[model samples]
Structures are given as C-alpha cells and as structure tokens.
Target: APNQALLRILKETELRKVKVLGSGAFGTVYKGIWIPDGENVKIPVAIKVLRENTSPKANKEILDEAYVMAYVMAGVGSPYVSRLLGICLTSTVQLVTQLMPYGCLLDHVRENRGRLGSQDLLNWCMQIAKGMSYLEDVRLVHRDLAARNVLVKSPNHVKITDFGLARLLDIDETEYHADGGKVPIKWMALESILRRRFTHQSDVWSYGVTVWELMTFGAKPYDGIPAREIPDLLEKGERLPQPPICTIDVYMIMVKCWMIDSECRPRFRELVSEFSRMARDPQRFVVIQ
Candidate 1:
C-alpha cells in the first residue's frame, strides 16, 4: 500500500500544465506541479508515467521502476539521490519525484561549456561520489551511472536519478544480467561488455565515463568507435585520452576506474574522500588549455 498521507494529498492535488521532459527505454517523464488541496501552494515535480495501453511486459517494466524508486527512497533516504514524493496508481501508473530545476548534469555541461570553473566541476564529482557511496553501502547497483542520469538542482548541487535499471543484491550476489537485453557499450566496463556481468564495480566504470563527459562538456564517450569493436580495442589497452580541461589528478582517477581488473578500481567512498581532498587543495591540480 502507498503512504496514506501522500495518497490523500495526491487525491486532492492536481497535476497542472504537464509537459514532456524526456522519453527513454523505461517510460516518459513529465514536468508538472502538485497543487495540494486546491490551494495556491504548487510543488514542482517530475512525473514518470508509463505509456498508455501498453503490453504486459511494458507494464511490468514501469511497475518495477516504481518499486525500485520506492525501495531506494526507503532504504538510503539520502539527499544526494532523488526523493520519491508519491505514486499515482491510475491506469497510467505515475511515479513522482522532486523536480530538478536545472535539469540533468549533461545539460549543464553542454550549456555552460568553457564557462564552468574547476571548483564547480569538482563539487559535482563529489556529490555524485557521495550518492554512489550511499548506494554502495546499501548493496545496490546502479547499472546505469552516467552524466545524463545525474540530475542538477543547481550548479554543483546534484542527485543521482533514473534507477530503472538499479537493483539490490544479496550478500553473495555480485553480478546481474538479462538475456537479450541492450547494453550501453561506451560506458560499460570490459567485464560487463564481454561477459554480461554487472556489479557495483561496473557502475564505477560508468562513473568514470561520466567524469569524462563532464570534462569534455557532454562529448560522447568512445566517439566514432563502433560498438562491436570496443571489446577488442579495450583488450588491447585502448582508452579515452585525458580531456583538455581535466587536471591530471582527476584524469588519473578516471583511468583507475577503467582498469581491466574490477578489483583494481577505487571504491566510491575512496573517490569521495579523494575528490573532497582535492577540492580543499586546488593548487596541486593542473588544467591544460
């Protein structure tokens, strides 16, 4: 059962002036307001609603996403992740979360470009590491961790969102896979790409690509490389070059994340500590033209 308080509030609340935010594999997102009790107090929200008149599989996918969102909110309850406000159990199932006014981190990087200072970038990295650390502590794996999935509340203030592919793991569970399912090759770790094995370490690999995206201002990872050729290239030690705006220290962390052996990767907690330390002592880092 859903929370009675939220249910009651949502019953009286109207979703006004709904507009499409984005549509992806899971469902379509909408930007709207929750007008409570017919009052003037409007709360902005991002509603992820399932497609209308869909097949059973599609329905299950959307429902699973809602459950995942609820489970994450109940488990970690961290500010670094999106907060589920409520759920609407209508014919079109809707999962509502607080709106990120500045949109996704990718959008910020694309729009701001050269205008973004190193401090703001470092702050963003720290916030993401903090969120991932929480996920790591809870034994959850965000199968997709990238710049596009990171929501920006404001410059340097961000949260991890889009958990449609996220899952909780048992003590012995270290990998997950879906037969014939699609994969994000560019951001995926070599183990994941070759063996279809996914774990928190794979998420770390994706996070490194996300950092690359930030440094390069939303440039696509492995640009111009065919997806089919990535495995061979990776096996031969090919990796993305250091972005022009990235400091060597920051790029080293990204390189560590791309290590062929999953055990060699730094944990999210370690990343958080290192980035926080770097933020405090900015002079040690260097940015080349």
Candidate 2:
C-alpha cells in the first residue's frame, strides 16, 4: 500500500526495448519506446527493471525506490531530477524515466576528456549542486551521488538519476544505516565509510568527489589505493589531491566537504547561493514554486 504511486500504468508487453543502456548495482536499464495509451507519439524512455527472481529483497527494494521517485517527480519537482514516466510491476518491477539521449555524465566526460574547458566542468558541478539542493530541501539523501549516477541532458545540462538507495529522511531519524549491505566506499564521507552512517551531510561529502570527477573528466577516486587503505589515509588528514585543471576557489569546496566533522560541511543550498553570488547563477534547474 505504501509503494503505490499516482503513476501511469504502462503495460509491460508494450515496452519495446531498443538496447541495453547499462546494468547498475540496483538494476538494468534499457533504452525503450512506448506508446502512452492512445498517444500516437511513441515516447523514448529509460526503463530500469528489478527482477524479483534475482534476490529476496528485490521487490521490497524496488518498491521503496518507486515511492521515493514519485515524491521527487510529483511535487515541485525540479527540472534537474530525471522525469519519471511510470512503473510496470509484473514479474519484474520497472521504473521508466525519460531517455537521456546523451547517456551518463561519466562516459560523456571521458569521451570529451581534455576537450572540455574548466568553465564547462564548473558549470556541470554548479548544475549538480542546484539539483542536490532540491533533494536536500526535501530531506532526501541520494546515498549514491556521483558522475556515473548523473545523466547528460546536454553538454551544458545535467540531471541527477538513480534512486536505488535514495531515501527520504525521517525527522525522528538522524541517519540511515545499511543492514549489512555494501556501500559506495570511495565516495563516502569518513563517518559513512567507517560507521555506515548516511545523512544529507554524507551526500554532500559525495558531491565533493563528484565535483573532483568533473574537474578530472571522470577520473576514478583514489587511484591505486585499495579501499581498505582509504579510510586510514583519510583519517590521517589525507584528502583527494586538487585537480591540475581546478581553481583554488573550486578546490576549496572539495576541501570543506572533506571536513572531518560532518557538521562542518556546507549545505547544498548554501553552495548554490555562493555560486549565484559568484555570478554563475545556479538557477539553471529552477523549480516551479
């Protein structure tokens, strides 16, 4: 009952998959086309499916994701979040969102590599910051936030996607702890890495890694260092090195996000205002009031 959403019901049979986009930790996504009940125009979409046969918790996990997506896509849904079309729950539960023609930010950044200018990269980071602000305002924590989770709307536009572990924070709860599930270690904050403690603050810590990724055009975090050594490295006050292409001002943002104390990290909206005050208005993803 809690999983039911005011969403369009697309018949699973009508989903015509064009190709496989990618399979992620949560589920596999397909580039598909669908005719939305009597509509002549076929809508191109990204269908992420979870086959319950694969695991005991697939059904429960997918449903939780569906409800979160509904909340995000329904209200004053900011343009920066991926647009959800509907869910098709048959043997497998599917989440159909708008097709991002350009695919994910990770591949796009790598394909363009040094061709992209610093300003362009900063632009992408600001756009993500704006999108993150919307999520933060709604008390949602995108447990997984990174360049790979970002979809390219255009070279100049990006939208945050992947709600697999995304969850709405309860006022009664201070943080979400994994029930022995693997977390994204490299992108996590120190508290998150060691304690599996996740909050909006942890997501901000991730955003800093994502910003560094943009600067380096999708360089993987912590090269050569094994995951086990990362926390020890970070505990000794070691943080990711500044990208050669990054400005000191921009690099400082990452530094603050790496603040040992989670409470010391700056909030997303505060970063948005800072960006706007710098004359790089982050209103690019402006939401409808």
Candidate 3:
C-alpha cells in the first residue's frame, strides 16, 4: 500500500502529456510531473506504467519490484543511488521513483559519444557498482542491470533505477518470477544468456558490462558481437575490449567478472573492497570528499 499523503499527491496531480522515457515488455516509462507540486513546474519522475490488458501475473511484477526495493533500501544511505517513492494501482499500476532529471546514463553516453573524461567515467562506474554491492548484500540481484537503468541526477550524481526486472536469487531454487522478457541483450551476463537464470554471480557479469557501458560513455557493451556468438565468445574466455577510456585496473576487474563459471564471478563484497582500495589511492581513484 502507498502512503496516503503520496497517493493524494498523485491522484491530484494532472499528468498533462507523458514524455516517453524508454520502453520494455513490462511497459513504457514517461517523464512527467505531479500537478499539485507547482504551476509551470515539472518534477522529473520515472513512471513505469503497465500495458493495458496485461495479465494479473504481469501486474504482480510491479508489486514484486516494489517489494524488493523496499527490502534492500532498509536505512541504506548513498545519495548516488535512487530510491523508490511509491506506486499507483487504481487506474493502472505505476511505480513512482525519485526523478533523475539528467536522464539515463546510457542516453547520456549515446548523445555524447566518446567525450567523457577518464576520471568522470571511472567515478560513475564506481558509484553504480557500489550501489549494486549494497543490493547484493541483501541477496537481491538486479536481473537487468545496465547503463540505461542507471539514472543521472547531476554531473556528480548517478543512481541505479528500473528495478522492475530485478530478481531475488536467495537460494538454488527454480522459482522463475518473469523471464524479464523485455531487456537489452548487450548488458546481459553470459550465464543469463545461455542458462536463462539470474544469480548474484550473474549480476557480477552484468556489472562488468555496466562497467564497459560507463567507460565507453554508454556505448553498447559487446556490441557487434552477435547474440548466438556469445556462447563461443564465453567459451574462449575472451575479455571485453578495453576502450580508450578504460584504466588497467578497471579492465582487469571486468575480466574477473566475465569468468566462464558463474560461481567464479567476484562477490559484491570483494568488489567494494577493491573499489575502496582504489578510492584510497589518490592516483587510481579519487574519493569524493
């Protein structure tokens, strides 16, 4: 259930025209504002509205994503990460989250191409990985993690968004929530692509792709690499290309993440530890003080 105050705000708010933010099987997102907030002022909130005539099972996904977000965001603090505000279930089910006016990191890169400085890309990757580490500790896996899902609040702030496809891989059980049927292929892990399963390790694989996304200013990860070819690519254990912006250490991290055996993927805790070390070294990664 949503907070009454928030619900009231949403109910009264007139969504004049929704700007299509992005789309997937679940629904299309729009950038809109809550009318009651102010006049001629629009707050950028990501509204994930399900398609009309969607099945009840599909509807349950909204609730699932909401529930997972609530579970992991229990008193965590890292301004770089986005937080779930609430949802609307009356006219239609829509998950509301804090608006990231700067838009998706993916779009930011696509629009800018290879213009980002090395340091800027490094910092963004670190922040997103840190956010994922937090969620990983809670046994949650962001099934569809990628740059498009990561939102930018400002030049200095980046928060992971679009948890609608996130899956809880707490155990070795066969509980398929939703195939997450509508996500980009470039960002998926090798195991997820072949086995059709998501786990903490699989998330690490996704994280590596995300790292590439940040390094290349949102360039498609493993692009030009065909979907079917991924199996042989993984079999050979070749590493993703090191873009001009990637540092040696960061490239090594990506290799570790792409380990063939999913279980070999580095744990989020390990990733945090390495990132913290890099941050401590002034030359490698500067800590944002």
What lDDT would each prediction earn against the true structure? 0.78, 0.75, 0.67
Q: Which pairs of residues collide in candidate 3?
A: none
lDDT of 3 by residue, 1-289 (tens): 5442233226534443368877776677887765545467555667778755545555576566667566556456456566666555657767677678889888887877745554566667667778887777666677878887888887777887665464322222344334355345566676677767788788788888887776666666666877767677778866678866545786788888888777777877777777656645535642222
| Ten contiguous residues with the weakest lDDT in model 1 | 169-178
lDDT of 1 by residue, 1-289 (tens): 4552333325523665378988764468989888767476889999887655444554676576556656656744777888777776666677788899999899989998768877778778888999988877777778889999999998858999875453322122233222223468999999988887888899899989998998788999988888999999988999999988767888999999999999999999999998898767655653534
List residue ranges in candidate 3 displaced over 4 A. 1-9, 12-18, 35-43, 71-78, 164-185, 276-289
Where is model 3 poorest over a 10-residue stretch in terms of lDDT? 168-177
| Clash totals in order | 0, 0, 0
Best by lDDT: 1
TM-score (C-alpha, index-matched) for candidate 2? 0.86
- lDDT winner, 1 or 3: 1
lDDT of 2 at 123: 68
| Candidates in descending TM-score order | 1, 2, 3
User: Which 10 consecutive positions of candidate 2 have the poorest summed lDDT?
Assistant: 169-178
TM-scores, in order shown?
A: 0.87, 0.86, 0.80
